[PDB]
C-alpha cells in the first residue's frame, strides 16, 4: 500500500502515477534520459510513512546522480524536478501567485523593500506580470538551481524557507534599477532588462542577484585602498578594510609606500602587513573562511626579498603573512635589467623623492631619477642580480600560485586615465580592476579616494551575432549606473571614487564555448582575428551606451581626468606589437565616436574589465569567463550529494573544445589576452598554466617561466593572476 | 583441506568420489537395509553433482577416525566468577577443536558495582581463551562477543577494537555484537536520551529486553525515574554515532535486533529466548549459563550446517528430494559426533537444531534476469525462500513421524501451531506481493500433530571455501568482480564467476549497486522464512559521496531500513578502497 506523510502531518496512499507524470513533464524534449531508470533508483529508497518532501529530494537526487558526458540532459531533468519542488515549497503549488499579491505579501513580511510599493502602482505590477514567463525556469541546469537555492533566492536563513522563484527575482531586480526612470520609458526598460537576464544574455553578480529588491543596500564587492606612509594612514586603511570585509568585499591594498625596516617603520613593512591581514580576517568564521585580499608593492622596494617569500609556508612566524595574496609591480626598466643580465637597485620609497610617482606615471622620468639615485651613494640602497630577483619571484609564484604581476607602465600608457592627474597604481583582489586612488588621513577623510567598481558580464553563448550587443550594452550600462546611485557607501572616500568617476567593469563569460562553436582554438592563433572582432564590438558598444547616457544625464563629475576627455581612445594607445599577430580591421566608426565623446563625454570613466566568474556562469551553464575548461564535466561537493555540470552543447562540440591541459603552452592564450586588452578599459584576470609532464623530469624550467612572463609583457598584458600547475 | 592425506609427507590417499560416497555411507550407516543404500546413492548424487554443499569439518572428517565436527558454539555467561571460569574453560575446549565462538557477556555487572573492576578484564580473559590454541596468537580461533546497547559500560565497550587507545582499554582480536530493540531506536528518532544501567541494578530488565518488549518498556521507564539506582544518561544520537563510527572503521561491530529475534522466531521467548548469535551472525538459538564446565544444567547451543546450490537445480520442486536428504544426513550426524562439554550435548540432543542455507544466489538472480539493487528480485526471492523453508519443514516433519520429534520440541512456537508466515515483520507486505504457492495450512496441522525432528532448519551462513568446490558465488552475496584472485605457494589461483560467457551483463557486481536498499529488502524478504538469521553485510563506496566521506546520515538510515524490514542481524560493513 505504502503511505505518505503530507505537508501538515497525516498519512495518505502513495501515488505512483502523480510521480510518473511529474517525471514525464520534466523529461519533455530531453534526450537520452530514462524516466524508468530514475523511477527504479528512487522507489527502492521509499518506505512506509515517508515525508512528502523527502520523495522529491529522492527523485531529484536520483536524476542528479545520472548526469554524465553520455547523458548530459539529466542536468535539465533534475533541474526541472527541483524547480517543481521549489514552487510547491514557496507557494504551496506549481503556479506562482500574481506579481502584485506576492510583492505585497513579501514587503509585509520584511523580506522585500517597501519602496517597491511606493514606486509602482498595482496596475504597473499587473503590466509587469505580463512580461514574466515562468517557464524560463525550465531552462536552468541542475547546478544553476542549486546556486539559486543556495545564495540567490530570498529565503529564511534559519528555517530554510524559500519565499520566491527565479522570475520574481529577475523582474524585481529590473524594477529597482529602473525605478527612477520617467514613466515614458520606465516599464519598457524593465521589460527588456528582464528579458536579457532571464534569457542569460546579461550575467549579474552575486550581491546584486541576492540583494536588489530586499531591504539591504550593501552591493559593493570590490574595493581598492591605497596606504600612505604614516601611522594615521595605516590606521585609516585598516579601519576601512574592517568596515568593508564585514560586508564581504574583496580588498586590493597598495602598501608599497611604507618605508623599509631601518629608515630614519624603523621596524618595517611586515608588522603592518600582518595588521592588514588581521583586518581582512577580522570577520571570518574561524579566521580562514571568508574575507580576501591582494597586497601590492614595487619590485624595487628595499624590503622586496623578504616580501616575495611572505606566503612560503616553511619559514618563521614573524617572517610570514600567508593569508593574503601579493602583486609584484614591474616596468620596462626592471625587465630590461633582466635581459641585459644586469643589476636592480632597491630603495626605500622614503629615500628617493619623486621616484615612486614616476614609476607609475612617467617612465623616462623614472629612468632619469633611478639612474641618478643609483649613482648618488649617500642614499641607502641594496644591489641585486636581476636574474636572482625574477627567479625568486617566479619561484614563489610557481609554488603558491598566488604571487601576481602588474605591469604598471602598461596600466598607464594604455589607460582611460591621465596618469599625471589620476594614475592607476594597484589592482583589486582578482587583478582585473585598474582605477585611481588616493591615501586617507582618517577613516572619514573626504580628501582620500577609495576605488569601487560595479561588475557584470555578457554571455557570448546566448547572443546570435555581435550587433545584439548594442541593445545589451545600453541595458547593462544603465542598469549598473543606476545602482551606483542606489547602494550605500560606508566610507566617504569610497563615495568620492564612485560618484566622481562612476566606474564600471563589464566583462564576458562563455568565451571557450564561443570559440568552440566558431571552430577556433586557444593555443594555435586560430582565434586571433575573431577575438579582435569580438572585443572591438564589445568596447565600441559599451562606449556608445555610456555616451548616449552622458547626453541624456550628464557626464561623470571627474570626466575631465580621463584620456577619453582629451579625444584619445584605446585604439590609439594599445601595445604596437599586437599588429604582428592579428590583422582584423575595425568594423565600427571609431572616428564618429571619438568626436561624439569629445563633445558629450561619458557617463562612466571605465566600462570594461574581464573578471573571473564561477558562481555567476553556473546560473546559465557557461564556461567560466575567458578560461578554457579543465574537463567536460565539472564536479562540485554539497551536503545534497555530488553536483555535476556538463560544458554547454557537449553533444555536438566535444571535439571543438580545447580543454585547458590540451594546450602545448601559454603562447596562444597570452596572445588572446593581449588582443583583448587592446579594447579593455581596465584589465583581465589572465592565468598562466603548466603541466609538469610536458617537461623533462617533470620539472618546469625557469627559462619557460621567464619567457612567458616577457611574452605577456610583449603583447601589452597589464596583470598576471593565478599560476596553475597540473598535479598527477 | 578435504582429501585424506598425510599431513607430514604430503601423500594423498584418496580421490573426490571416494570422499563423497563414504561421507554418504557414514551418515546413513544406521538406516534399515530396506532403505539404506538407496539413501546412500541419492545423497552421493546430490553432493557429487553439487546440489548440496557440505561444510569443511564434514567434508574432511566423516569417514575418518575423528568425531570432531562442531564448528560453531554459542556460550552464555552468568554474572559470577564460577560462570566466568566455566565459560572460559568451555571456549578453550572448543577452540582446540577449531570451533568459532559466540559469547554473550552482557550479564557481567559494570565497573563500580557493589566486577568491582568491571567487564573489560574478563573480556581480555575470553580473548586469551579464544586464542589459547593459535599458531602465534593471531592465526586461528575466532569469536564475537555480545552485549546490550544500554549497558552502563557501553561507551568503553564500543571502542574496544579501536587500534589507537591504551592497552588496558582495548581487546582488539574479538568482534562485537551490539544488541538493540525498538525502544533504543525510538529514542534515536525522537532525539531523546538513552539511560545506561548495569544489569545487576535493574531486576527483570535484562530478561524483558529479549522476551517481553512492553515489560521492558515498563521497567525501563520505572528505573529511569527511580533515582536511587546507579545510572548514566546519554544523548541517543551520540551513542548510535559512536557505534556506527566504530562499525565503519573496523567493519566488525555488529548489530542484533533482539526484539526481531524473539517476535519472529521458532522459539517461545518466555521458555527459551534467543539472546545472542554466533561468530558470523546467522545462528540464533537459546542458551543457559553454566556454573561449572560440567554443569548439566547449563546449555551451550550447537548447529550443524549445510547449503543448497541454487545454480545446480533446474526448478524449485527439486528441493523436496534435496531437503529430505539434507535434513536426514545432518540429523544423523548429531548422533554421530562427539560432545566434549555436557551443556553442549544438552543443547544438541534437546533441540536438534540445524542451519541449512544457500549458495550461488547472485548467479541465480543473474540467470533469471534479476538484479539486487532495484527491487526486481523481490517476488522471486519470496518465491525461492518460501520453497526452501516449506520443503525443509516438510522433511523434518516426515522425519518426526518416522523417528519421533525432538525432546524439547514443546518449547518451539511451532509446537503451538504458529508458523514463520504468521510472525514476520508486517512491512514486508509493502515491497513484495508474491502469494504462497504451498499448502502452509496442511503443514501447520501436520506439525501440530507430529511435530518436527529439528527445532530450527534454516540459517543463511557465509560460505567461501565451500562454494569454491562447486564454482559458486558466495552465499547470497554479489561478487566484487568477475574473476576472484587467491594466493597459494603454488602460484596465483583464479576463479571466474559461473557462466561468465553468457551472463557478464546479467550480473550486478557489488560496487555497481547505487546503495544498500535493494539488498536489504532481499534480506528482509528472506528472513520472512528463515528460522534463524542471515549474515547480511552493509557496503559503501566512498567515491559515491561528496569529498569521499560516507555520511553518518546514510549509515543511520540504512540501519533503520534493515530494522524496518525485520532484519535480525547486521554483520560486516565493507568499505571500498581506492
Amino acid at each position: 500500500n505504502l503511505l505518505v506523510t503530507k505537508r501538515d502531518g497525516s498519512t495518505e496512499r502513495i501515488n505512483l502515477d502523480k510521480i510518473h507524470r511529474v517525471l514525464d513533464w520534466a523529461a519533455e524534449g530531453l534526450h537520452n534520459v530514462s524516466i524508468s531508470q530514475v523511477e527504479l533508483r528512487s522507489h527502492i529508497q521509499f518506505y512506509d510513512g515517508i515525508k512528502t518532501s523527502d520523495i522529491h529530494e529522492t527523485i531529484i537526487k536520483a536524476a542528479a546522480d545520472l548526469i554524465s558526458r553520455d547523458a548530459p540532459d539529466y542536468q535539465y531533468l533534475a533541474a526541472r524536478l527541483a524547480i517543481f519542488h521549489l514552487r510547491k515549497k514557496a507557494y504551496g503549488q506549481f503556479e506562482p501567485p500574481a506579481l502584485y499579491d506576492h510583492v505585497v505579501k513579501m514587503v509585509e513580511m520584511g523580506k522585500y523593500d517597501n519602496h517597491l510599493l511606493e514606486d509602482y502602482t498595482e496596475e504597473e505590477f499587473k503590466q509587469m506580470d505580463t512580461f514574466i514567463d515562468h517557464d524560463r525556469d525550465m531552462t536552468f541546469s541542475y547546478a544553476a538551481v542549486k546556486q539559486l537555492e543556495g545564495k540567490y533566492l530570498v529565503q529564511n536563513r534559519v528555517t530554510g524557507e524559500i519565499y520566491e522563484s527565479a522570475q520574481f527575482l529577475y523582474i524585481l531586480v529590473a524594477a529597482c534599477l529602473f525605478s527612477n526612470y520617467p514613466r515614458e520609458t520606465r516599464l519598457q526598460y524593465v521589460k527588456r532588462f528582464y528579458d536579457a537576464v532571464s534569457t542569460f544574455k546579461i550575467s549579474l553578480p552575486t550581491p546584486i542577484m541576492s540583494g536588489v529588491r530586499t531591504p539591504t543596500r550593501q552591493f559593493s564587492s570590490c574595493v581598492l585602498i591605497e596606504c600612505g606612509d604614516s601611522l594615521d594612514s595605516i590606521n585609516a586603511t585598516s579601519s576601512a578594510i574592517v568596515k568593508y570585509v564585514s560586508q564581504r568585499a574583496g580588498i586590493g591594498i597598495n602598501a608599497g609606500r611604507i618605508r623599509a625596516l631601518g629608515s630614519p617603520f624603523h621596524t618595517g613593512c611586515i608588522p603592518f602587513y600582518k595588521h592588514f591581514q588581521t583586518a581582512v580576517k577580522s570577520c571570518s568564521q574561524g579566521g580562514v573562511r571568508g574575507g580576501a585580499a591582494t597586497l601590492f608593492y614595487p619590485m624595487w622596494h628595499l624590503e622586496v626579498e623578504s616580501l616575495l617569500v611572505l606566503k612560503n609556508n616553511r619559514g618563521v612566524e614573524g617572517n610570514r603573512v600567508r593569508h593574503m595574496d601579493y602583486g609584484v609591480q614591474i616596468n620596462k626598466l626592471m625587465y630590461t635589467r633582466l635581459l641585459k643580465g644586469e643589476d636592480i637597485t632597491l630603495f626605500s620609497p622614503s629615500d628617493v623623492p619623486g621616484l615612486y610617482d614616476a614609476f607609475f606615471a612617467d617612465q623616462e622620468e623614472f629612468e632619469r631619477l633611478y639612474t641618478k639615485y643609483e649613482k648618488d651613494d649617500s642614499i641607502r640602497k641594496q644591489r641585486v642580480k636581476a636574474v636572482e630577483l625574477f627567479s625568486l619571484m617566479m619561484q614563489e609564484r610557481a609554488s603558491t600560485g598566488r604571487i601576481y604581476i602588474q605591469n604598471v607602465d602598461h596600466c598607464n600608457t594604455h589607460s582611460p586615465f591621465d596618469p599625471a592627474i589620476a594614475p592607476v597604481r594597484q589592482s583589486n583582489l582578482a587583478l582585473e580592476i585598474a582605477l585611481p586612488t588616493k591615501p586617507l588621513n582618517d577613516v572619514n577623510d573626504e580628501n582620500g579616494e577609495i576605488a569601487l567598481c560595479t561588475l557584470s558580464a555578457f554571455n557570448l553563448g546566448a547572443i546570435n551575432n555581435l550587433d545584439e550587443l548594442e541593445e545589451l550594452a545600453i541595458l547593462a550600462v544603465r542598469a549598473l549606473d543606476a545602482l551606483l546611485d542606489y547602494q550605500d557607501y560606508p566610507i566617504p572616500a569610497a563615495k568620492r571614487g564612485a560618484m566622481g568617476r562612476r566606474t564600471l567593469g563589464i566583462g564576458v563569460i562563455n568565451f571557450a564555448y564561443y570559440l568552440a562553436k566558431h571552430g577556433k582554438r586557444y593555443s594555435d592563433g586560430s582565434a586571433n582575428n575573431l577575438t579582435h572582432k569580438t572585443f572591438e564590438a564589445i568596447q565600441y558598444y559599451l562606449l556608445k551606451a555610456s555616451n548616449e547616457l552622458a547626453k541624456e544625464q550628464g557626464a561623470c563629475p571627474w570626466f575631465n581626468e580621463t584620456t577619453y576627455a582629451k579625444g584619445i581612445l584605446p585604439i590609439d594607445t594599445y601595445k604596437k606589437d599586437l599588429d604582428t599577430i592579428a590583422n582584423e580591421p575595425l568594423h565600427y566608426d571609431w572616428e564618429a565616436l571619438r568626436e561624439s565623446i569629445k563633445t558629450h563625454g561619458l557617463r562612466n570613466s571605465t566600462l570594461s574589465a574581464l573578471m573571473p566568474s564561477e558562481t555567476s556562469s553556473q546560473i546559465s551553464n557557461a564556461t567560466n569567463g575567458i578560461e578554457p575548461p579543465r574537463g567536460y564535466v565539472s564536479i562540485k561537493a554539497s551536503k545534497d550529494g555530488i553536483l555535476r555540470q556538463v560544458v554547454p552543447d557537449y553533444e555536438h562540440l566535444h571535439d571543438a573544445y580545447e580543454l585547458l591541459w590540451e594546450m602545448p603552452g601559454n603562447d596562444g592564450y597570452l596572445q588572446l589576452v593581449g588582443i583583448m586588452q587592446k579594447f579593455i578599459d581596465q584589465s583581465i584576470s589572465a592565468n598562466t598554466n603548466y603541466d609538469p609532464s610536458r617537461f623533462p623530469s617533470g620539472k618546469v624550467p625557469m627559462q619557460q617561466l621567464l619567457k612567458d612572463l616577457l611574452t605577456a609583457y610583449k603583447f601589452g598584458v597589464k596583470t598576471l593572476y593565478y599560476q596553475n600547475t597540473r598535479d598527477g | 583441506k578435504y582429501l585424506v592425506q598425510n599431513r607430514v609427507t604430503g601423500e594423498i590417499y584418496e580421490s573426490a568420489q571416494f570422499l563423497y560416497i563414504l561421507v554418504a555411507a557414514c551418515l546413513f550407516s544406521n538406516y534399515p537395509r530396506e532403505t539404506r543404500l538407496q539413501y546412500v546413492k541419492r545423497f552421493y548424487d546430490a553432493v557429487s553433482t553439487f546440489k548440496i554443499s557440505l561444510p569443511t569439518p564434514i567434508m574432511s572428517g566423516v569417514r575418518t577416525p575423528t568425531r570432531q565436527f562442531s564448528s560453531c558454539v554459542l556460550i552464555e555467561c552468568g554474572d559470577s566468577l564460577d560462570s566466568i571460569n566455566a565459560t572460559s574453560s568451555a571456549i578453550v575446549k572448543y577452540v582446540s577443536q577449531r570451533a568459532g565462538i559466540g559469547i554473550n557477556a552482557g550479564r557481567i555487572r559494570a565497573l563500580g558495582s557493589p566486577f568491582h573492576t568491571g567487564c573489560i578484564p574478563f573480556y581480555k580473559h575470553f580473548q586469551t581463551a579464544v586464542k589459547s590454541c593459535s599458531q602465534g596468537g593471531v592465526r586461528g580461533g575466532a569469536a564475537t562477543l555480545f552485549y546490550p546497547m544500554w549497558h552502563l559500560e557501553v561507551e568503553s565497550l564500543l571502542v574496544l577494537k579501536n587500534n589507537r587507545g591504551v592497552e588496558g582499554n582495548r581487546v582488539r582480536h574479538m568482534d562485537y555484537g551490539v544488541q538493540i530493540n525498538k525502544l533504543m531506536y525510538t529514542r534515536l528518532l525522537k532525539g531523546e536520551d538513552i539511560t545506561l544501567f548495569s544489569p545487576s541494578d535493574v531486576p527483570g530488565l535484562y530478561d524483558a529486553f529479549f522476551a517481553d518488549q512492553e515489560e521492558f518498556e515498563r521497567l525501563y521507564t520505572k528505573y529511569e525515574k527511580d533515582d536511587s539506582i546507579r545510572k548514566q544518561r546519554v544523548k541517543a544520537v551520540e551513542l548510535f554515532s559512536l557505534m556506527m563510527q566504530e562499525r565503519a572503521s573496523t567493519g566488525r561491530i555488529y548489530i542484533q535486533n533482539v526484539d526481531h529475534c524473539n517476535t519472529h522466531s521458532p522459539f517461545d521467548p518466555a521458555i527459551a529466548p534467543v539472546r545472542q548469535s554466533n561468530l558470523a551472525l546467522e545462528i540464533a538459538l537459546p542458551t543457559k549459563p553454566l556454573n561449572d564446565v560440567n554443569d548439566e544444567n547449563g546449555e551451550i547451543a550447537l548447529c550443524t550446517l549445510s547449503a543448497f546450490n541454487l545454480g545446480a537445480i533446474n526448478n524449485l520442486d527439486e528441493l523436496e528430494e534435496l531437503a529430505i536428504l539434507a535434513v536426514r544426513a545432518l540429523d544423523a550426524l548429531l548422533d554421530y559426533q562427539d560432545y566434549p562439554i555436557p551443556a553442549a550435548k544438552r543443547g544438541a540432543m534437546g533441540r536438534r537444531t540445524l542451519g541449512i542455507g544457500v549458495i550461488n544466489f547472485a548467479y541465480y538472480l543473474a540467470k533469471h534476469g534479476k538484479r539486487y539493487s532495484d527491487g526486481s528480485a523481490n517476488n522471486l526471492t519470496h518465491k525461492t525462500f518460501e520453497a526452501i523453508q516449506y520443503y525443509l519443514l516438510k522433511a523434518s516433519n516426515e522425519l518426526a513421524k518416522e523417528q519421533g520429534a525432538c525432546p524439547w520440541f514443546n518449547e518451539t512456537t511451532y509446537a503451538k501451531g504458529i508458523l514463520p508466515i504468521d510472525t514476520y515483520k508486517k512491512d514486508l507486505d509493502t515491497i513484495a506481493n508474491e502469494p504462497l504457492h504451498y499448502d502452509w495450512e496442511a503443514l501447520r496441522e501436520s506439525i501440530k500433530t507430529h511435530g518436527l525432528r529439528n527445532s530450527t532448519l534454516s540459517a543463511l551462513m557465509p560460505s567461501e571455501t565451500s562454494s569454491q568446490i562447486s564454482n559458486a558465488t558466495n552465499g547470497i552475496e554479489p561478487p566484487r568482480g568477475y574473476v576472484s584472485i587467491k594466493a597459494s605457494k603454488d602460484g596465483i589461483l583464479r576463479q571466474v564467476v559461473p557462466d561468465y560467457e553468457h551472463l557478464h551483463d546479467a550480473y550486478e557486481l557489488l560496487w555497481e549497486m547505487p546503495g544498500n536498499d535493494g539488498y536489504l529488502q532481499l534480506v528482509g524478504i528472506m528472513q520472512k522464512f528463515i528460522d534463524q538469521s542471515i549474515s547480511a553485510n552493509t557496503n559503501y563506496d566512498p567515491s559515491r559521496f561528496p569529498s569521499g566521506k560516507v555520511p553518518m546520515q546514510q549509515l543511520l538510515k540504512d540501519l533503520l531500513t534493515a530494522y524496518k524490514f525485520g532484519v535480525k542481524t547486521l554483520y560486516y560493513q565493507n568499505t571500498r578502497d581506492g
Binding site: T5, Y47, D48, G49, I50, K51, D54 | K182, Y185, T186, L188, L189, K190, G191, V237, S241, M552, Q553, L556, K557, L560, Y563, K564
Partner: peptide, 11 residues
Amino acid sequence: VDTDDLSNFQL
C-alpha cells in the same frame, strides 16, 4: 546528523 530528517521514519 539531522534529528528532524530521521524523526519522520516509521519503525
